[PDB]
């Protein structure tokens, strides 16, 4: 298995409120992957863009991992690694940013 605690963008289990305060002051492109407290073993991407903190569901269906149906990956790591180099705009027109800065900076 993959130990995600070794990555500077993994916040573990964390509420949305706790995330909004952690990313409100950082630059656009600052992000973190967190476990949703209300959904066990389901994760979300939280990305700072403009002056808001967006939250994207990480869906797991039919052994694929994806934030959009049109682009799927074999693991959460491959998903995060892809959007570190490709903007979210390709599937979220209002989110023209990559996963630029891990929130542990």
């Amino acid at each position: 298995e993959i130990d995600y605690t070794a990555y500077p963008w993994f916040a573990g289990n964390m509420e949305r409120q706790q995330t909004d305060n952690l990313l409100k002051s950082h630059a656009s492109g600052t992000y973190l992957i967190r476990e949703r407290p209300a959904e066990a073993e389901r994760f979300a991407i939280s990305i700072k863009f403009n002056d808001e903190v967006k939250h994207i569901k990480v869906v797991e269906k039919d052994n694929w991992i994806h934030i959009t149906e049109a682009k799927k990956f074999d693991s959460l790591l491959e998903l995060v690694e892809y959007y570190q180099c490709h903007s979210l705009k390709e599937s979220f027109k209002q989110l023209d940013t990559t996963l630029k800065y891990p929130y542990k900076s």
Partner: peptide, 5 residues
């Protein structure tokens, strides 16, 4: 509440 939905 989430971008997707």
């Amino acid at each position: 509440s989430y971008v997707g939905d």
